[PDB]
Design an enzyme around this catalytic site. Structure first.
Site, short mmCIF file in Angstrom:
data_model
loop_
_atom_site.label_atom_id
_atom_site.label_comp_id
_atom_site.label_asym_id
_atom_site.label_seq_id
_atom_site.Cartn_x
_atom_site.Cartn_y
_atom_site.Cartn_z
N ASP A 38 -23.53 2.59 -22.12
CA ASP A 38 -23.04 1.94 -20.89
C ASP A 38 -23.28 0.42 -20.81
OD1 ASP A 38 -22.48 4.62 -20.10
OD2 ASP A 38 -24.59 4.83 -19.49
N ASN A 77 -20.48 9.61 -5.64
CA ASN A 77 -21.78 9.61 -6.29
C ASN A 77 -22.26 8.14 -6.47
OD1 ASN A 77 -24.10 10.55 -7.61
ND2 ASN A 77 -23.08 10.69 -9.61
N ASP A 125 -23.49 3.74 -11.33
CA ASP A 125 -22.64 2.81 -12.08
C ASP A 125 -22.18 1.56 -11.31
OD1 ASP A 125 -22.97 4.89 -13.82
OD2 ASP A 125 -20.85 5.21 -14.24
N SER A 182 -18.76 7.41 -9.49
CA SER A 182 -18.67 8.27 -10.68
C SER A 182 -18.27 9.67 -10.29
CB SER A 182 -19.99 8.35 -11.42
OG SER A 182 -19.90 9.34 -12.43
N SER A 236 -16.74 12.72 -8.29
CA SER A 236 -16.86 13.01 -6.86
C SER A 236 -15.75 12.36 -6.06
CB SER A 236 -18.23 12.58 -6.35
OG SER A 236 -19.24 13.34 -7.00
N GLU A 238 -15.68 6.88 -14.04
CA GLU A 238 -16.94 6.18 -13.82
C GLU A 238 -16.97 4.83 -14.56
OE1 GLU A 238 -19.90 9.08 -15.04
OE2 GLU A 238 -19.56 8.73 -17.19
N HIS A 266 -17.24 3.63 -20.92
CA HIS A 266 -18.05 2.85 -20.00
C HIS A 266 -18.14 1.39 -20.45
CE1 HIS A 266 -21.29 2.99 -16.75
NE2 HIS A 266 -21.08 1.71 -17.05
#
Ligand SMILES: [Ca+2]
Ligand SMILES: [Ca+2]
Length: 802
Positions: free
Chosen positions: A11, A191, A194, A211, A213, A260, A351
């Site tokens: 990430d 959520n 990130d 991310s 959700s 995300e 990411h």
């Protein structure tokens, strides 16, 4: 020629500090480079205290860890500090009154929805960073509630929401945040992980985050303090998107769908805000894939090349939405292609961050990726991006090696290319190249037809099978042929990306000659398995095979191993290699070895009241607790079937050395005496990682003993036999490149084929009694025997009796 130094930073968030590029990623990893090619790591991960970024991790970030991320639920056993973003805030007021600091916004998480975003500050970019506040929470509930393996109360009163209502920043809790049963409504609300901090055109500061959700949200941020300026009141945007009093404005995702690692870039040269997000799941099986959108405003609406919204209309497949700028791919090195190995490809790349150079206008996509045939191993990659004529940055096909846009001559464009099309779909599948020619008459032919134009110095317009893609021609370093090659990358108004890589000019006879040289069946003197006989070489060269004795090995490389004791049987395979009117031939002398008894590689007898290996090939075993990873439990020793055996109290297990089984020909034998049966409880368990595993199960889902495998695919090798408690049962199974036999007290009880290949190439984690999901085994285990090759039925009987 160019040289690379790699690191594993998940990430990665890129930032330039003077002359050095830095990347900050998950698990408190960071690294630096002067050139974006050679990276050097300067952190020490979760090591605490004296944590490189956070010092005393547990005490510094305690305010955040109170809600999630410290030894709680999925973070039990350690820490979960995820996906940070670092940047220099010139207006930040420090606790001594001075102006300016580096801010790291991080995330902490305990479940797929209980997370929080907080931030810390520092005068220098390498740290250490000192906690400031925890600013966004998710996964909270209406009334008191708790998660498994968690003592933390998820009620909304344990977040910053009461403090905000108190200060008058919110009028009070939103009813829509909870389901009827009081649970957190992650269908519409996010959520909290990130984060991404970005400046807009006016220098206002913003934070996008999210991310899966309910998707991706954006909040305006106070530059002096670094705290969100909460909307305070619900609403909708002019164009109809959700606005929430607390979480902010929804800019992408929704309805549980993936998405995300948001990254947003304002580009003054086109006056667009570019939104990058990653679909799918990070694992090698997950189809991680980067998506691109844009807006004229920092808070949306973000749309793709088709003009479709980043925000989903409902619980639907998100594949159509967003320019898919990179997914799984492989420029395969076919037989006769220069170089070695399978070629350059990525699995689950994503990411990302983006470095946009305020000066040279150069732009770089920075991300992590896995690799074909490498498992979950990941590295950082950097690809340059180039603004196309439609205002979309397009991604270079190869990693950055120092190249820049140059004036390109038509002479250097014309010729054969390998072509990869990323499409819109995503999965564990890998896209491979096709072969086309860009002709001097501005036509395209070969595996596809159409046209091409070079416009100005280097812009490209490629039209294939109806579709026009716009991008650039650019010279790039190909690591396979180890030359700089002409390449192109272009994007359609469908949001579909094509990549082209130019091949060396070669006559048909040169190609067939190259193929013949490169063609190799490996060691053909000790053949124990079927041979893969390639029927294609590079550039659609055809290869056809014949045998000189099909009783030994067929035309397809199917082999017939002789009876144990027989001499090795030999034969010749002959390859005919054609392309156009060129032709060549190569012959291969195959020697097929007879069947053989399986060889004992390890033997854990417990005869010395320890966890040692009798053959001395492998190290000792170690004691576990409730699962394969953790520790704590105990292993006592009682009288067994042969000598002393190992006792499992029901809260312990035995961890065995890594790579105990490291092939696709192998067998396992052991005596068990179960004190109690529980469904899916393992005895012998081996896994390359928590997604590819084999388990020998006393009582399975059918209520019977079986050999079982997961998580992709799923193999149910069942015996329809029920194992008795309080008595000694011998269990053995064998695997042989696909076929599998299971034995109960010396009797065959299951023959099947197409059994998974869990352990080749990896070096799996193995255990006795414990996995990741199920109650440990309770009873006695004795004489664990591991073999290479498939146990003959004769060997099975001997173990079952003496
Ligand atoms: Ca990020
Ligand atoms: Ca023993």
């Amino acid at each position: 020629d160019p040289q690379f130094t790699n690191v594993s930073v998940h990430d990665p968030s890129i930032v330039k500090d003077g002359d050095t590029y830095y990347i900050f990623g998950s698990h408190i990893e960071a690294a630096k480079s002067k050139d974006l090619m050679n990276w050097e790591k300067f952190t020490n991960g979760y090591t605490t205290p004296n944590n490189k970024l956070y010092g005393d991790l547990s005490k510094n970030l305690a305010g955040s860890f109170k809600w999630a991320g410290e030894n709680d639920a999925d973070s039990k056993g350690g820490f979960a500090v995820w996906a940070p973003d670092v940047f220099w805030n010139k207006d930040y007021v420090n606790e001594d009154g001075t102006k300016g600091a580096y801010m790291i916004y991080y995330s902490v998480s305990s479940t797929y929805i209980r997370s929080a975003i907080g931030y810390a500050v520092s005068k220098h970019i390498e740290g250490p960073y000192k906690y400031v506040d925890t600013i966004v929470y998710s996964g909270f509930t209406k009334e008191e509630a708790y998660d498994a393996n968690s003592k933390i109360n998820k009620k909304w009163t344990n977040t910053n929401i009461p403090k905000l209502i108190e200060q008058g920043k919110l009028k009070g809790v939103r009813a829509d945040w909870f389901h009827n049963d009081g649970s957190y409504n992650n269908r519409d609300f996010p959520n909290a992980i990130d984060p991404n901090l970005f400046y807009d055109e006016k220098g206002n500061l913003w934070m996008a985050y999210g991310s899966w959700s309910g998707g991706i949200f954006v909040l305006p941020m106070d530059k002096t303090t670094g705290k969100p300026i909460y909307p305070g009141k619900d609403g909708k945007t002019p164009d109809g998107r959700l606005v929430d009093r607390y979480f902010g404005i929804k800019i992408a995702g929704g309805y549980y769908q993936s998405g995300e690692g948001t990254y947003i870039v304002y580009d003054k040269n086109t006056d667009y805000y570019y939104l990058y997000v990653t679909y799918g799941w990070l694992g090698a099986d997950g189809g991680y894939n980067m998506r691109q959108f844009r807006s004229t405003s920092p808070t949306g609406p973000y749309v793709d090349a088709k003009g479709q919204s980043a925000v989903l209309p409902g619980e639907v497949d998100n594949s159509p939405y967003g320019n898919k700028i990179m997914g799984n791919f492989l420029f395969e090195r076919k037989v006769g292609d220069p170089g070695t190995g399978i070629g350059v490809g990525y699995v689950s790349p994503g990411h990302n961050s983006v470095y946009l150079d305020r000066k040279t206008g150069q732009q770089f996509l920075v991300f992590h990726t896995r690799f074909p045939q490498s498992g979950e191993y990941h590295e950082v990659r950097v690809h340059q991006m180039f603004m196309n004529k439609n205002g979309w940055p397009v991604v270079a096909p190869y990693r950055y090696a120092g190249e820049k846009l140059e004036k390109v001559n038509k002479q250097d464009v014309v010729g054969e290319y390998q072509l990869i099309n990323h499409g819109k779909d995503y999965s564990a599948d890998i896209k491979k190249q096709i072969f086309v020619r860009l002709n001097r008459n501005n036509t395209i032919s070969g595996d596809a037809t159409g046209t091409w134009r070079k416009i100005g110095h280097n812009q490209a317009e490629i039209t294939i099978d109806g579709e026009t893609y716009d991008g650039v021609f650019v010279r790039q370093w190909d690591p396979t042929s180890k030359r700089y090659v002409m390449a192109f990358t272009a994007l359609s108004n469908e949001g579909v990306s094509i990549w082209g890589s130019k091949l060396a000019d070669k006559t048909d006879e040169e190609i067939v000659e190259d193929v013949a040289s490169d063609l190799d069946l490996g060691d053909t003197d000790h053949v124990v398995s079927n041979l893969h006989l390639p029927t294609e070489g590079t550039r659609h060269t055809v290869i056809s095979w014949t045998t000189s004795d099909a009783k030994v090995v067929s035309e397809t490389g199917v082999v017939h191993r002789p009876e144990v004791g027989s001499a090795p049987v030999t034969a010749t395979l002959t390859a005919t290699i054609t392309k156009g009117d060129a032709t060549a031939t190569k012959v291969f002398h195959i020697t097929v070895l007879p069947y053989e008894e399986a060889k004992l590689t390890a033997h854990y007898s417990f005869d010395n009241n320890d966890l040692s290996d009798s053959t001395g090939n492998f190290g000792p075993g170690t004691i576990t607790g409730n699962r394969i990873d953790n520790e704590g439990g105990t292993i006592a020793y009682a009288d067994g079937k042969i000598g002393k055996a190992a006792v499992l109290n029901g809260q312990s297990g035995i961890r065995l050395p890594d790579g105990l089984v490291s092939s696709n020909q192998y067998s396992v034998s052991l005596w068990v005496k179960p004190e109690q049966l529980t469904t899916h409880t393992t005895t012998f368990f081996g896994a390359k990682d928590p997604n590819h595993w084999i388990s020998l199960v006393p009582q399975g889902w059918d209520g019977n003993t079986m050999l079982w495998s997961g998580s992709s695919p799923w193999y149910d090798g069942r015996t329809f036999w029920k194992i008795p408690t309080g008595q000694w049962t011998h269990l053995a199974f064998s695997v042989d490149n696909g076929a599998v036999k299971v034995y109960i007290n010396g009797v065959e009880k299951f023959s099947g084929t197409n059994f998974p290949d869990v352990f080749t190439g990896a070096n799996a984690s193995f255990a006795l009694g414990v996995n990741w999901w199920d109650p440990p085994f309770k009873g006695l285990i004795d004489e664990l025997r591991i073999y290479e090759g498939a146990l003959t039925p004769s060997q099975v009987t001997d173990l079952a009796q003496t």
